[PDB]
Amino acid sequence: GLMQFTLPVRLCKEIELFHFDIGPFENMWPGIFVYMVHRSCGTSCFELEKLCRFIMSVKKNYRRVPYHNWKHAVTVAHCMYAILQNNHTLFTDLERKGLLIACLCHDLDHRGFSNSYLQKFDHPLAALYSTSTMEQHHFSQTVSILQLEGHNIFSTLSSSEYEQVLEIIRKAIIATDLALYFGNRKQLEEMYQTGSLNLNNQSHRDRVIGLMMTACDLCSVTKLWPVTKLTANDIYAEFWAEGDEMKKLGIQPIPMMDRDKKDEVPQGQLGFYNAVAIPCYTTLTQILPPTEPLLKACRDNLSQWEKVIRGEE
Ligand SMILES: CC(C)(C)c1ncc(Nc2cncnc2)c(C(=O)Nc2cccc(OC(F)(F)F)c2)n1
Ligand SMILES: [Mg+2]
Ligand SMILES: [Zn+2]
Numbered sequence: 001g002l003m004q005f006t007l008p009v010r011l012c013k014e015i016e017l018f019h020f021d022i023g024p025f026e027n028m029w030p031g032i033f034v035y036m037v038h039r040s041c042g043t044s045c046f047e048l049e050k051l052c053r054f055i056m057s058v059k060k061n062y063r064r065v066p067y068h069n070w071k072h073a074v075t076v077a078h079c080m081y082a083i084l085q086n087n088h089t090l091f092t093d094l095e096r097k098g099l100l101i102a103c104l105c106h107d108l109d110h111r112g113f114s115n116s117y118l119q120k121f122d123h124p125l126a127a128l129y130s131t132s133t134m135e136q137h138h139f140s141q142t143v144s145i146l147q148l149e150g151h152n153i154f155s156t157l158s159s160s161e162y163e164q165v166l167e168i169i170r171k172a173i174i175a176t177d178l179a180l181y182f183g184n185r186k187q188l189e190e191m192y193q194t195g196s197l198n199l200n201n202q203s204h205r206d207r208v209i210g211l212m213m214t215a216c217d218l219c220s221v222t223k224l225w226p227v228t229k230l231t232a233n234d235i236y237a238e239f240w241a242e243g244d245e246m247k248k249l250g251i252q253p254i255p256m257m258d259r260d261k262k263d264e265v266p267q268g269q270l271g272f273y274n275a276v277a278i279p280c281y282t283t284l285t286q287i288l289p290p291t292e293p294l295l296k297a298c299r300d301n302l303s304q305w306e307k308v309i310r311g312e313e
Contacts (some may be wrong), residue, residue: 003048005035015128018219018293020081021227022074029074030055033104036081041096046153054101057145061108068110068235077103079219079294080186083212086290090199094157096100099209101153101190103216108141110134113236113245114178120249132177134251139173163300168209176217178276184210185283192286208287213293215284221277222297225304266308273302 007015014020015032020031037045046054062070090098104219115133118126129136143166145154155164175184188207191197198204199222220231228259244259255261256268281295307313 001043002236003032004043005038007032007035008195012103015078016082016085018079018291019223019227019297020078020082020204021094021223022071022078026070029070030059031264033074033077033100036078037100040081040084040100042095045093045097048152050153050155054151055104057151058108058147060143061145063109063111063147065112065214066241067231067234068107068112068238069220072107073094073104074141076106076219078218079103079216079222080212083288083291087110087228087288095168095209096164097154098168102169102213105142105145105169105216106138106173106176106213108138110138110146111244113176114250117242117245120251123310132174132180135174136175139170139236141226142169154265172209175213178217180210181214181276181280184214185279188283188287189203197287198225211280211284211287214280215291218277218280219294221273222281223303225301228301228304232265232269236262266305270302270309273280273298273305278302 006012011023011032014051015035030052034048034051037051038187058073060069062068062073077100080099084099113121113134115126115131115135117123118133123133125133125137146154146166154165157165171283174180183209186198188211191204191207220235221228223231239257240259242260243253244255246257252258255264258264277298278295281291281298285292285295304313
């Protein structure tokens with residue numbers, strides 16, 4: 001009970017900031033997650049023996065891919081932690097429990113290929129889950145691990161609290177399907193502007209959690225430019241591999257996934273910032289004003305890509 005996780009001074013201070021990088025020491029990441037769980041949720045939230053066994057099972061079920069790896073799981077969980085800590089009173093106990101676990105589990109068993117590639121390959125998962133293919137698989141993987149003997153971190157919740165938390169996690173993971181983000185933000189924009197947004201409405205909370213999940217999932221665009229730029233190599237490493245696999249199926253991939261078209265990436269990032277990233281962090285700042293540093297970091301990084309295209313770097 002009295003066993004608190006403590007980080008070195010520099011991490012203890014920087015972990016509270018949105019632009020925190022979790023560092024290259026893999027063996028510190030579980031402790032960084034437990035630290036955030038204890039401060040975000042409480043030391044009572046989870047049995048430490050069960051939590052530690054859950055964390056290491058999740059880690060085992062993330063693959064050795066360039067981007068959709070264990071580091072991403074923890075990095076996304078950290079963004080959620082920063083949003084929850086800056087929005088203390090807005091979220092219930094069950095939501096702070098569920099969401100940190102949802103983020104850690106949101107890309108479980110990712111092979112580094114899009115829902116689109118699974119469909120064109122005719123992968124079994126595409127037959128099992130017609131839409132949001134990988135995300136339904138991520139939730140499936142999350143339930144499987146929870147049901148491993150001595151892994152059920154929610155055991156002390158009631159039947160209805162258990163069913164509520166797993167429903168928060170399912171919606172949260174399904175919302176990381178970027179295909180579902182465009183309509184979710186648009187609805188949230190209308191609701192905010194017409195002033196019909198109501199956080200006591202469960203359907204409206206769901207949409208706001210959805211947007212929070214997109215913002216956490218994209219948080220690599222909200223880091224210091226050195227972090228954002230080097231993470232962008234890992235992301236394009238996966239895109240170009242999928243491009244290669246499309247060519248193998250006899251399909252020219254989109255320029256974004258074509259390694260023969262690397263020159264187009266700077267402009268491709270501009271579109272992504274303008275079409276997805278900036279809108280996402282703007283709506284989020286409108287609903288949750290203390291999340292404004294994500295929008296500011298994201299705009300700084302937009303400018304850095306503009307500087308790449310102008311040949312200044
Ligand atoms: C896996 C998924 C959630 C979809 C994702 N995550 C991070 C991304 N960028 C990133 C940037 N810097 C560092 N780390 C990650 C991109 C991306 O660049 N997506 C992208 C890039 C170009 C065009 C495009 O089309 C779209 F705008 F319609 F989404 C999408 N996509
Ligand atoms: Mg995903
Ligand atoms: Zn992700």
